[PDB]
């Protein structure tokens, strides 16, 4: 396939070829143009708080060691020995000042340096230049209110610029709330779906909720219960959608602070969020303080998704075009009572974890949409994402980014796939930039 020429994504992101969810060759090309180029979620301050704390994370299909240094900074390294390529670390988290390869015993620091080699002096004498044999390092590591992202491409935009207009919507909860903490260990399950199926679902899909999640809505009695089985439509002005230059976007459901949690947790959550909203009105104004306690369904491009207020935090780790390893954490506001944090964390796993009754409703949707992209008569078919097109705006006085002023639409799909097509047909960030110079105009075109 010629990725320079092939139109995988039509103009304004209105449709995509179904083969994007199944073609193995394109998957291998995404490893170059998507996962080697873009910012990928690594960990949180709360998981590696002290010097020498480390976790292992995926970055695409590569695996990296993410380590808190003695000076408080964070560095991340390929989890691969510089001698004969063995995996250096085989646990998920720990604390150490160095990592010893169990093959020939080469000793690396927490700072990635090759510090010792067994019998160096008798074997290599002075020949071994240890300064050039440190662990391959992730070039860019940056934080967003404690959420740590990595990028292998040194030319990537700063993480804040990469979040673009989406950062404005996230900041009330991520920053003005006092800050979030990530609750580990994550649930981990493999689904037979492309990584883009869940990514698109979380970025912009409020349409599916009442139908796909009808049974979960009706059994649990959460605040959206009345949507079960499409019995009702969310009222005029129930929410909004947005998207941004580098692909991130989200839906906003006004006031839904208890999110998907069942009736048992609703009252405490609604009281906690209402009280904090009342204090934030004075710090950041009514609109931003209301965004804080509004449910955000977001995808941070390419493959990190979240539900603020529900507290679900997801990493769609790519294995091959029909295989994805799903990592599920909980995110909680640091100043909540510890007992409420625990219950919220359990509730996140109950709804969206490995035995999540909401997440399990989505499996067949994700897996068969993905597997149908390998089928001969569907490869060249068009997946549609035109709902709301012609009504999105840019430059609004209140809400930044390309915005669709209604709760249910496909604005965020269009911006996600516009950035995706610009990456896949570019060789580097400069070319992405050149291809994105009219991004908001292309997305608001008919408007």
């Amino acid at each position: 396939m010629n990725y320079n020429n092939k139109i995988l994504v039509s103009e304004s992101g209105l449709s995509q070829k179904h083969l994007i969810h199944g073609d193995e060759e394109l998957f291998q090309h995404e490893l170059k143009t998507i996962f080697a180029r873009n910012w990928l979620f690594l960990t949180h301050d709360s998981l590696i708080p002290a010097p020498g704390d480390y976790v292992t994370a995926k970055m695409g299909i590569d695996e990296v060691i993410v380590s808190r240094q003695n000076d408080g900074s964070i560095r991340a390294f390929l989890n691969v020995c510089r001698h004969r390529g063995k995996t250096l670390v085989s646990v998920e988290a720990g604390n150490a000042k160095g990592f010893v390869c169990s093959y020939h015993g080469w000793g690396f620091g927490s700072n990635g340096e090759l510090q010792s080699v067994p019998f160096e002096k008798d074997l290599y004498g002075e020949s071994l230049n240890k300064k050039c044999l440190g662990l391959k390092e992730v070039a860019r590591v940056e934080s967003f209110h404690g959420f740590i992202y990595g990028c292998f491409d040194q030319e990537a935009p700063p993480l804040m610029d990469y979040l673009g207009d989406a950062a404005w919507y996230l900041e009330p909860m991520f920053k003005h709330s006092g800050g979030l903490e990530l609750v580990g260990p994550p649930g981990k399950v493999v689904i037979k779906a492309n990584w883009k199926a869940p990514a698109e679902n979380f970025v912009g899909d409020a349409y599916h909720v009442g139908w796909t999640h009808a049974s979960s809505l009706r059994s649990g009695e959460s605040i959206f219960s009345s949507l079960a089985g499409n019995a009702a439509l969310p009222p005029e002005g129930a929410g909004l959608q947005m998207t941004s230059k580098y692909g991130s976007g989200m839906g906003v459901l006004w006031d839904g602070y208890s999110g998907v949690h069942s009736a048992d947790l609703v009252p405490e959550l609604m009281a906690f969020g209402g009280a904090k909203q009342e204090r934030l009105n004075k710090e950041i104004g009514d609109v931003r303080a209301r965004i804080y306690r509004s449910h955000l369904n977001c995808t941070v491009f390419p493959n990190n998704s979240m539900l603020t207020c529900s507290g679900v935090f997801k990493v769609w780790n790519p294995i091959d075009a029909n295989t994805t390893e799903v990592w599920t954490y909980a995110i909680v506001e640091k100043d909540m009572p510890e007992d409420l944090k625990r219950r919220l964390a359990d509730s996140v796993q109950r709804t969206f974890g490995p035995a999540g009754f909401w997440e399990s409703d989505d499996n067949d949707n994700m897996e068969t949409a993905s597997q149908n992209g390998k089928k001969y008569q569907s490869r060249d078919s068009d997946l549609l994402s035109n709902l709301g097109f012609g009504e999105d705006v840019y430059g609004d006085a209140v809400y930044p980014g390309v915005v669709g002023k209604s709760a249910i639409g496909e604005t965020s799909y269009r911006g996600f796939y516009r950035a995706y097509q610009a990456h896949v047909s570019s060789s580097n960030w400069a070319e992405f930039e050149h291809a994105s110079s009219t991004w908001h105009t292309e997305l608001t075109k008919t408007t």
């Binding site: 998920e92 009808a214 390893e325 109950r350 035995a355």
Partner: protein, 193 residues
């Protein structure tokens, strides 16, 4: 008994549980335990979840399945949360899960799923302090098949506590499972172990 300073791979929790069963292996208890687990698995296998909740599960139940983060065998400093709950349910939380299973708009249950449970290695021992409380340990292989060619097999050791309620019916009051595969390769863990 287990000397966990010499038997260096054994956890303190595993050493405690084996101590409880290596002593008392009462025949009437074994047969009661075996009968309880075989009938509970039969109900679950034919998807009689309401009947399972009514006849096998106690109102004070804690139904928990954990997934434990993988850590160095020598780890001594890192002490953040070790495990996450795949399940950590009370009776009402089970009831929500049972309603979700029986709802006719639960699209993933059409065509009907097929479940087959294999329960083995049953051990039973009365609690020392609570004479109405029976500790039952058993191992399960759970086969779930659906939609032509999806086949998922789960494996696990179950640490239960069963208690006589009213009627003299012994009902499940605690199930604890430390799920042995860290990364699930069964699409989800939406089955009752």
């Amino acid at each position: 008994m287990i000397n966990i300073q010499e038997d260096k791979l054994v956890s303190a929790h595993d050493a405690e549980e084996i101590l409880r069963f290596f002593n008392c292996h009462d025949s009437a208890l074994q047969q009661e335990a075996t009968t309880l687990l075989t009938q509970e698995a039969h109900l679950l296998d034919i998807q009689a979840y309401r009947a399972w909740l009514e006849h096998c599960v106690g109102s004070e139940v804690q139904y928990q399945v954990i997934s434990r983060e993988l850590r160095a065998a020598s780890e001594r400093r890192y002490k953040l949360n070790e495990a996450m709950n795949v399940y950590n349910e009370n009776f009402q939380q089970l009831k929500v899960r049972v309603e979700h299973q029986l709802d006719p708009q639960n699209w993933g249950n059409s065509p009907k799923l097929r479940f087959t449970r294999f329960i083995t290695n049953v051990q039973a021992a009365m609690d020392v302090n609570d004479k109405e409380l029976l500790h039952i340990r058993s191992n399960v292989i759970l086969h779930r098949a659906r939609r032509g060619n999806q086949v998922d097999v789960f494996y696990a050791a179950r640490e239960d506590k069963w208690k006589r309620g009213e009627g003299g019916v012994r009902k499940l009051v605690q199930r604890f499972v430390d799920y042995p595969e860290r990364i699930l390769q069964t699409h989800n863990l939406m089955v009752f172990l």
